[PDB]
């Protein structure tokens, strides 16, 4: 469902608990495309709360398994993001997406 390649390890201990809150820089583009917003350029970390369903599947399950400074490359399919349905406007229906994510830390 999604798939995870390290850009930069982080330290291998450290890693998001049940209902913490993630802070992470991003980077989202459409499988060899189109990429559709970053928090790095704004210069503002994006927060999430794990178990909350707040964020499309790929991306949860994506930061769950990194450790506090890791970067990776999140490959994401279509059934781990937005589906058949797509997100109206900006993500078509059965996007494969990539996103560059880093976790900077848990609070
Ligand atoms: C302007 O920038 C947007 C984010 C944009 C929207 C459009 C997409 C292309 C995108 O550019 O992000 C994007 O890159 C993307 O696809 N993202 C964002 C990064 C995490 C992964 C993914 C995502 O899941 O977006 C999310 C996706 C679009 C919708 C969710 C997908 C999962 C599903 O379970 C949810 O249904 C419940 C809806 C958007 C978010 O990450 C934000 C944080 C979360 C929500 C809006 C909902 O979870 C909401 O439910 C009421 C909440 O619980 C929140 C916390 C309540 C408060 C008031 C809302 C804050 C809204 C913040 C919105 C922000 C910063």
Redesign the pocket.
């Given at each position: 469902g999604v798939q995870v390649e390290t850009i930069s390890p982080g330290d291998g201990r450290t890693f998001p608990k049940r209902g913490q809150t993630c802070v992470?820089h991003?980077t989202?583009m459409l499988e060899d495309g189109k990429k559709?917003?970053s928090?790095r350029d704004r210069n503002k970390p994006?927060?999430?709360?794990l178990g909350?369903?707040?964020?499309?599947?790929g991306?949860?399950e994506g930061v769950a398994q990194m450790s506090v400074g890791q970067r990776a490359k999140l490959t994401i399919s279509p059934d781990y993001?937005?589906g058949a349905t797509g997100?109206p406007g900006?993500?078509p229906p059965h996007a494969t997406?990539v996103?560059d994510v880093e976790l900077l830390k848990l609070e």
């Open positions: 992470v991003y989202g559709f917003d928090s994006f927060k999430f709360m909350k369903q707040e964020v499309i599947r991306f949860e993001a937005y997100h900006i993500i997406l996103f």
